[PDB]
Design an enzyme around this catalytic site. Sequence first.
Site, PDB file in Angstrom:
ATOM      1  N   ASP A 194      14.291 -29.928  25.534  1.00  0.00           N
ATOM      2  CA  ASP A 194      15.455 -30.740  25.215  1.00  0.00           C
ATOM      3  C   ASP A 194      15.281 -31.413  23.862  1.00  0.00           C
ATOM      4  O   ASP A 194      16.250 -31.665  23.147  1.00  0.00           O
ATOM      5  CB  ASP A 194      15.680 -31.803  26.291  1.00  0.00           C
ATOM      6  CG  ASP A 194      16.178 -31.215  27.594  1.00  0.00           C
ATOM      7  OD1 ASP A 194      16.632 -30.048  27.589  1.00  0.00           O
ATOM      8  OD2 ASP A 194      16.126 -31.924  28.621  1.00  0.00           O
ATOM      9  N   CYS A 230      23.835 -20.311  20.652  1.00  0.00           N
ATOM     10  CA  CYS A 230      23.323 -21.616  21.025  1.00  0.00           C
ATOM     11  C   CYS A 230      24.535 -22.514  20.786  1.00  0.00           C
ATOM     12  O   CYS A 230      25.616 -22.005  20.480  1.00  0.00           O
ATOM     13  CB  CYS A 230      22.130 -22.019  20.153  1.00  0.00           C
ATOM     14  SG  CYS A 230      22.379 -21.941  18.374  1.00  0.00           S
TER      15      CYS A 230
END
Length: 298
Positions: A194, A230
């Site tokens: 993350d 992405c």
Amino acid sequence: SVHVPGPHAMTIQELVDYVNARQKQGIYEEYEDIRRENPVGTFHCSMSPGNLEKNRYGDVPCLDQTRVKLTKRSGHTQTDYINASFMDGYKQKNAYIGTQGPLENTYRDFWLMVWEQKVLVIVMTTRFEEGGRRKCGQYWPLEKDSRIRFGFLTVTNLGVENMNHYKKTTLEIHNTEERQKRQVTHFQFLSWPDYGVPSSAASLIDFLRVVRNQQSLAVSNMEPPIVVHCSAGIGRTGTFCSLDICLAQLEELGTLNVFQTVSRMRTQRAFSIQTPEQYYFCYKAILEFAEKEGMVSA
Ligand SMILES: CC(=O)N[C@@H](Cc1ccc(C(F)(F)P(=O)(O)O)cc1)C(=O)N[C@@H](CCCNC(=O)c1cccc(I)c1)C(N)=O
């Protein structure tokens, strides 16, 4: 292809000295010089009326020169626009299509592109949301046998398999207008953290090999581009493609040039590699790969 071996490619030995001489901060500075460059191309089509709502980020348009055009039609109140760019690969034209994470209003465009471009493999590098940041819509049927209709295109899940670092889903795209069916493999890399970049590149390089082998297999049974995406289609996407390119050249000639590769990639998928950390990661991932391959002496 803009990705040809050299001029001035480096051997693992030279890369080692190159990184040691500059250090982390030196590499960060190098990235900042790439970022300084004035983009090569224009963004008129991406920033125009009607297509603005088709971009996940107002500050991430795609180049007019390399965008993927949709072969749309008359009065259906749509366009030929989709935030996606054709990307060359090592000695290969249009090896990839770098694009953003689909939005609800672009799901059908995404699949229309997959069909029109005859895509066999899709690579997703994020989750739908991370840290509270939306990064991709649920554009495909998640569980086996579930299906989603996108007009004349129907997508059905034929099976899913969870691996330690990635999940593989087999999809069947049914074009009801042309009465044709195709199988597409969807890959979702699960190990990108993350925050920051992967602590080790082993997982991502192994994932890359999985994708490469699946594309090869699909092609032999059908080269179409691999769709890689992405959130904005420039960070993790550019990292994946830059690594694939360098590693490809490293295998074939034992040399590579990260600077050249990233610089060339940014002329096709503008803004590829969004942070100095990801740029540094490219160098470190290669050095880590070389060590795992027993190519490095201390
Ligand atoms: C403010 C904002 O929402 N934009 C983001 C866009 C973004 C980029 C990359 C990611 C990512 F890393 F997660 P992914 O791996 O999915 O790609 C996510 C979001 C950002 O940080 N802004 C960028 C801006 C990118 C540079 N563009 C321009 O600024 C620009 C725009 C138009 C014309 C021109 I000439 C330049 C930044 N600031 O680093």
